[PDB]
Design a protein around this ligand. Structure first.
Ligand SMILES: *[C]C1=C([C])[C]=C2C(=[C]1)N([C][C]([O])[C]([O])[C]([O])[C]OP([O])(=O)OP([O])(=O)O[C][C]1O[C](N3[C]=NC4=C3N=[C]N=C4[N])[C]([O])[C]1[O])C1=NC(=O)[N]C(=O)C1=N2[C]/[C]=[C]/N1[C][C][C](/[C]=[C]/C2=[C][C]=C(F)[C]=[C]2)[C][C]1
Ligand SMILES: *[C]C1=C([C])[C]=C2C(=[C]1)N([C][C]([O])[C]([O])[C]([O])[C]OP([O])(=O)OP([O])(=O)O[C][C]1O[C](N3[C]=NC4=C3N=[C]N=C4[N])[C]([O])[C]1[O])C1=NC(=O)[N]C(=O)C1=N2[C]/[C]=[C]/N1[C][C][C](/[C]=[C]/C2=[C][C]=C(F)[C]=[C]2)[C][C]1
Ligand SMILES: CCCCCCCCCCCC[N+](C)(C)CCCS(=O)(=O)O
Ligand SMILES: CCCCCCCCCCCC[N+](C)(C)CCCS(=O)(=O)O
Lengths: 494, 499
């Protein structure tokens, strides 16, 4: 009934915000639509897998907020297996490699690949994390899809196919669907290309022991009966002294402040009185989430390691159902598994098949790529299609189509009276990740503390000391990588 | 509580559906979110204007369903004023003309203009009205914004600038926001470029006497108490034998079938049990409506007519708040008025101003365009920003960004168990218009009649006799229009001769 703050949504962001408010002595209620907490994180436990993350899972250096929160909740990390060689599968053949960037040998292709990565980061350096719409060339870059940019930039088919995979894999959408400005902001606000694509010393370095769902579950454990499961919010009324929040199951909650910790577009599921201001009213219709199926195939042993492969596979082309894989084996070396992502249009296409049909296709692919018949002998299979979720709308995060970020980007975390906005989409560092969810939850919480007089304005945004357990090493480039010409650069000279 | 069919939404589509169902003997209920029917049509009445349409207004030849419905409800139409000259305002100057297309004199620019319009229609003929995703190059065209298409197609800036205005004005969105396949489909399913842009012989030929809001009101009068105002639907449950529909004011309705007659994205406001299938679940997060303010400036007399201007202005430029106007003077010749549209990014930009600051900017623009100080002396002003409507989401209609129509398009009117989809967005002819609303509403109602075994399958889609009051002159082209070369095609003639 009556409380200080209603939080809408029990994902990591909402739970992080509720915890902060609780710890400062306010009465918080969390209204969660599902029969569980965690949102776009979900850890399934059964005897065959023990535990498996079917949503968000990876953390790495520079993600210091999710690591601090998780450590305080008593969680620990382990390292994703990258001891042996990575595989780039191109034109029906596997090429083993080391280091984060799939290498290339033809000298024109080399210049073209080097330039592509380098240009993503150069363009990034002119985009403010906290305001990408303030980039000098914001309108120019926002009025282009990533398909347009790649067509201009990539002089070789080899670079264009890897660039396309890069976009597909990072934001679960086609190059033609997404704004160039948004995608470049997105890479930049994760620390750039090397950081975003790296296992060792990057975003996929680590997983949580027991699964990432433990973050939300363990905060629910703290808050007790303050978390209301199967309470989808349908109605928020701000006309009176206190804010009134109504759920689908007819309950009414009364508060001084509200935090909306849901994906922007899922805002549409709530009827507002008074109506939302114009810009938010339209913004929440313009911000879809991507399309992905996360798939985990279990095997008797991690057989790929015997052939000096780590289990990472980068798989070019339209034919392959999965473009990217990591070893999902447990740190103890058991529950051997390969994790794969089915991305974008392939998620839509392959979801018509049965579970068994998807398993068969994945096993045949992995057999080809790893060059092993052992891949044809799976002991178990788990998957989750995030497209079918009424209360996610997809995964991993919200993408911005051409034109939207510059016109509506400002409104994303703009308070509407006593509603403040959280969720990973509103973060400025690792937005789209669990790290961003924490940053945005805590920030929105401190906005309400400031509105109440408890803290000064300069404490709303707070820095995070570096994790002692997951220290970040610097991103380095070489002289040649910095100064080698592009293909059109090499043409000018001749 | 109990009925045969709940219709969600009391716009033209919903009310047309309800009417057909009621006339066939079923018990129907219409649940409407607002305190009025009409949706994206809305006629304001006060003593200063008598009546004015702040939403959908114009009807024309080939729109035979809305004309037939309006006639059956006892409504009349009148012709929009196009007696005198149109104005094309470009780079700070006004160029009067006649006929639908702004003309050009420079021969190179002429070939480019002619080729732009012709290619729009050429690509359109490749695209099935009922299945745009079946066009041979559907994928190539849908992976492309209209901005990319115009950059490839227009060899002059003159043509590119006019083509940009054509997109902005027809779909209230920027060229970079919209799919090429979708836009080309949209134009084609209205009967092509000439039909869509024309006043005489086109979309903007006529208006209803007393306003277009009478269509929805008069159907409400036929239905009596079966229309429920201030019932926003929040929840649809299809787990049991009968469908349960719940409203925000805690009322429950029980029906055999539901027609959803709301814009696709406003489907997001409804919680579904069981959950929507994957494809529709994602589709309704991907289909926004455009941005527009409709503004009407009233004057003592229609002074433009005396300068031999009909009141139509096609206004190009970033500084212009309004890109298109029509004479909105009553047919009796009184309540002289200029109707204008503030489009796309300009609706957003200029919504920051007060009502009086917008009035001033409009008058100054009209003064310049018409060469008339009288334009600075308005007697009244009315406007409506459709962007702020919770239960519309924008106007005129839904646009599709790149990649969406080929991937999600086929689920737009695909039933979900016992929910059928109306709304103008689901039409195959004048989708986006009041015409499309009627087609979609009556088609969805008949899908239900078929499901109940009351009509055979071949009667779901029903053709419409031509209006005898508003006959359609066919779209014709001249020999030169058909065979004059593109700009690159002239350059190919030059390289082939001199070799
Ligand atoms: C799904 C997913 C997946 C599958 C995956 C992933 C993910 C996801 N991610 C993301 C995450 O998860 C996120 O971000 C988070 O979680 C979010 O949070 P928040 O914000 O909180 O939100 P959510 O969760 O959603 O929540 C919300 C809530 O609310 C609710 N609701 C609704 N509505 C409502 C409600 N309530 C009440 N009422 C109402 N009305 C709901 O229900 C919920 O609960 C992630 N993340 C991280 O961090 N990590 C990870 O891992 C993840 N994942 C992913 C990733 C992927 N990747 C990375 C990158 C890589 C790449 C690499 C490379 C490239 C290139 C080359 F060449 C190489 C390499 C891979 C991929
Ligand atoms: C808004 C608007 C405006 C401003 C204008 C316009 C329009 C609009 N349009 C459109 C119409 O209006 C539409 O389409 C219709 O109306 C639709 O219907 P429907 O489908 O039925 O839908 P609605 O209305 O929306 O309804 C719905 C309902 O529902 C409800 N809800 C929601 N949600 C809910 C509910 N309920 C319960 N629950 C829940 N949850 C609501 O409330 C409602 O009621 C139009 N149309 C027509 O036909 N006409 C017209 O006029 C119109 N408008 C416009 C036009 C424009 N334009 C045309 C074209 C031109 C061009 C020219 C040129 C170009 C170029 C050159 F060169 C030259 C020239 C322009 C203009
Ligand atoms: C050749 N491609 C790479 C197709 C375009 C060059 C881009 S650009 O012409 O340098 O803009
Ligand atoms: C010589 C270069 C002229 C480019 C002219 N534009 C119109 C910009 C592009 C023509 C595109 S296309 O070449 O017909 O595909």
């Amino acid at each position: 009934n009556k409380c200080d703050v209603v939080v809408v949504g029990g994902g990591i962001s909402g739970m992080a915000a509720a915890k902060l408010l609780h710890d400062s002595g306010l009465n918080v209620v969390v209204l969660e639509a599902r029969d569980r907490v965690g949102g776009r994180t979900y850890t399934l436990r059964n005897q065959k897998v023990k535990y498996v993350d079917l949503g968000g899972s990876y953390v790495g250096p520079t993600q210091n907020r999710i690591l601090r929160l998780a450590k305080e909740l008593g969680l620990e990390t382990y390292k994703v297996n990258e001891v042996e060689r990575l595989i780039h599968h191109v034109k029906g053949k596997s090429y083993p490699f080391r280091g984060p960037f799939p290498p290339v040998w033809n000298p024109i292709t080399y210049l073209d690949h080097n330039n592509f990565w380098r240009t993503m980061d150069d363009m990034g350096r002119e985009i403010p994390s906290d305001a990408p719409w303030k980039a000098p060339l914001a309108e120019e870059w926002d009025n282009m899809t990533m398909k347009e940019l790649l067509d201009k930039l990539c002089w070789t088919e080899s670079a264009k196919q890897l660039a396309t995979l890069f976009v597909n894999l990072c934001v679960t959408a086609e190059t033609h669907e997404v704004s160039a400005l948004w995608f470049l902001w997105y890479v930049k606000q994760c620390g750039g290309t090397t950081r975003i694509i790296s296992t060792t010393n990057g975003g996929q370095e680590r997983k949580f022991v027991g699964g990432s769902g433990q973050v939300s579950e363990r905060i629910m454990d703290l808050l007790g009966d303050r978390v209301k499961l199967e309470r989808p919010v349908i109605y928020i009324d701000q006309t009176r002294e206190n804010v009134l929040v109504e759920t689908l199951n007819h309950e009414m909650y009364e508060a001084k402040y509200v935090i909306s910790a849901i994906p922007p577009t899922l805002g549409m599921k709530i009827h507002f009185n008074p109506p939302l201001p114009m810009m938010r009213n339209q913004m929440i219709t313009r911000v879809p989430l991507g399309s992905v199926i996360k798939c985990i195939v279990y095997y008797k042993e991690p057989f790929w390691r015997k052939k000096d492969y780590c289990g990472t596979m980068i798989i070019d082309g339209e034919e392959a159902p999965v473009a990217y894989t990591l070893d999902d084996t447990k740190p103890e070396g058991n529950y051997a598994a390969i994790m794969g992502f089915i991305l974008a249009h392939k998620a839509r296409k392959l979801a018509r098949l049965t579970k068994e049909e998807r398993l068969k296709k994945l096993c045949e692919l992995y057999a080809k790529v790893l060059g092993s018949l052992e891949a044809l002998e799976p002991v178990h299979y788990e998957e989750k299609n995030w497209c079918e979720e009424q209360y996610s709308g997809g995964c991993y995060t919200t993408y911005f189509p051409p034109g939207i970020l510059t016109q509506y980007g400002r409104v994303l975390r703009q308070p509407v009276d006593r509603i403040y906005f959280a969720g990973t989409e509103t973060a400025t560092h690792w937005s789209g990740y669990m790290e961003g969810a924490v940053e945005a939850g805590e920030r929105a919480a401190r906005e309400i503390l400031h509105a109440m007089g408890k803290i000064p304005e300069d404490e709303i945004w707070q820095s995070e000391p570096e994790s002692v357990d997951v220290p970040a090493q610097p991103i380095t480039t070489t002289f040649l990588e910095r100064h080698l010409p592009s293909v059109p650069g090499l043409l000018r000279l001749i």
